[PDB]
Structure formats: structure tokens, C-alpha cells
Amino acid sequence: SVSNTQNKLNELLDAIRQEFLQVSQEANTYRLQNQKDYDFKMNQQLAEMQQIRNTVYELELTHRKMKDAYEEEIK
């Protein structure tokens, strides 16, 4: 009965050890997940801004070709 009680205590103190080990492991895992997901969205948006900037310059180059073209319809 007392030794049963001691058994209960020994089980519980192992449960506790396991529970705090799991908490520390999961913090690392979550941190890596969060970093990945944040970086994904940020790199995605950075890529999207790059594509927009490229398109703006493409528009500007194209206006220059058209202006050249009118500078030849004129000639």
C-alpha cells in the first residue's frame, strides 16, 4: 500500500520529466515551423514585387519603342 503509493509517485515523476522534455522539444519545432511559414510568405511577396517592378520597366521600355515608332511615322 505504501509501496503502491511510492509506485504512483514514481510513475507521476516520470510523467512530469517526460512532459517538460516534450515542451522544450516542441518549442524548437514550432520555432522552425513559424520561421519557415513567415519566410515563405515574405519571399513570395518579395518575388511578387520583383515581378511588378520588372513589368513597370517593361512598360517604360515599350512606351519608348512606341515613341520611337511615332518618331518614324513622323519622319
Place this chain on the structure above:
Amino acid sequence: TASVSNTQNKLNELLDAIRQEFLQVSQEANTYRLQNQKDYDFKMNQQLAEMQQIRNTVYELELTHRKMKDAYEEEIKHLK
């Protein structure tokens, strides 16, 4: 005049392209917002569930220790 026609058609293609690029960015705002909170909540809830589990085990440890104490107090009481 082929050059005028070509550049105009090119311009129209790029104007359409740039409109969709902007919309893809703005469209994604509520979806990224929803996902951010869903991910935050998944972690928060798991972490609270774990803390509560530790809390219960500590409580069980404490009741158990006190049961053992209720065995020594009664043997000391027999003893006397």
C-alpha cells in the same frame, strides 16, 4: 505602322498583366491574415493543453504524497 500597332498591343498585354499582379497581392491579404491566426491558435491551444496536463500531474503528485502522509500519521498514532 507595324511598330506602332505592335507596341500598342504589347502595352495592352502588360497593362493587363500589371493589373493582375496587383490584384494577386491585395487578394491575398485576408487569406494570409486568416492563416496567420489559424497557425497561431493551433500552437497556442496545444501549448495550453500541455501546461494543463503538467498542472494536473503536479496536482496528482501532491494528492499522492499526502496519502502517504496519511499512512505515516496513522502508524505514528498506532505507535503512541
Place this chain on the structure above:
Amino acid sequence: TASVSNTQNKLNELLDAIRQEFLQVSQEANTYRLQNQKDYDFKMNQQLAEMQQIRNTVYELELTHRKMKDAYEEEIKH
């Protein structure tokens, strides 16, 4: 003994301490959920205003090019 009184003391105090510690973890988690939303929204809204400003300047730039072309169509109208 006087000592058993004092270990029962530490016990009651350790138990009170652990209770406060758990409560503090739970209160912080709920406060931090709000900080997440508030912080996210501030940045989100800033990025929305900036993209819109870029979209508006690009529109002005395109409209301006239309203006120049207009000038050339009329000189050619000749």
C-alpha cells in the same frame, strides 16, 4: 516537532508559487494572442497603403504617357 511545521510551510508556499506560475502562463498566452492580431494588422495595413500608393503612381505614369502620345498624334495629324 517544530520542523514538520516548517516543511509543511515551504510546501504550502511552493504550492502557492506553482499555482501563480501556471496562472501567469495562461494569462500571458491570452494577452499575447491579442498582441499577435494587433501587430499583424498594423503591418498588414501599412503594406496595403504602400502597394496602393505604388499602384496609383504607376497609373499616373501610364496616364502621363497617354498625354505625350496625344501630343504626337496631333503633330502627325498634319
Place this chain on the structure above:
Amino acid sequence: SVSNTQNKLNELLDAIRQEFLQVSQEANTYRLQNQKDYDFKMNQQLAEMQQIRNTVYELELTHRKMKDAYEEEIKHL
């Protein structure tokens, strides 16, 4: 008035380059800020959990001190 139109084009293209640059520099700033915020809250919770764990450790110690004492009486008697 085309020359001025050209001035206007140049001014607006400059504004757009400056705006794109600002979006990029702000995203970089935000990324580090976000991580520092995340890391502070992660480390704070880990520290709180460490403190709880040590409080448990101590509970166990003084319980053993209580037991040990009851064991001296059971002996005495």
C-alpha cells in the same frame, strides 16, 4: 510641354523606384522584428516552464524532508 511631360514621367518613375525600395526595406525590418518578438515570447515561456520544473523539484525535496522527519519519529517511538 513634352519636355515638361518628360519631367513629369521622370519624377513619377523616381517616386516608383523609391516606393519599391521602401517596401523592400520595410519587409526586411519586419522580418527581424517578427523573429525577435517570437523569440522573446518563446524564451520567456521556456524560462517560466524551467521555473515551474524547478519548483516541482523543490516540492519533491521538501516532501522527502517531511517523510524523513516522520521516519525519525516512527524510529524514536
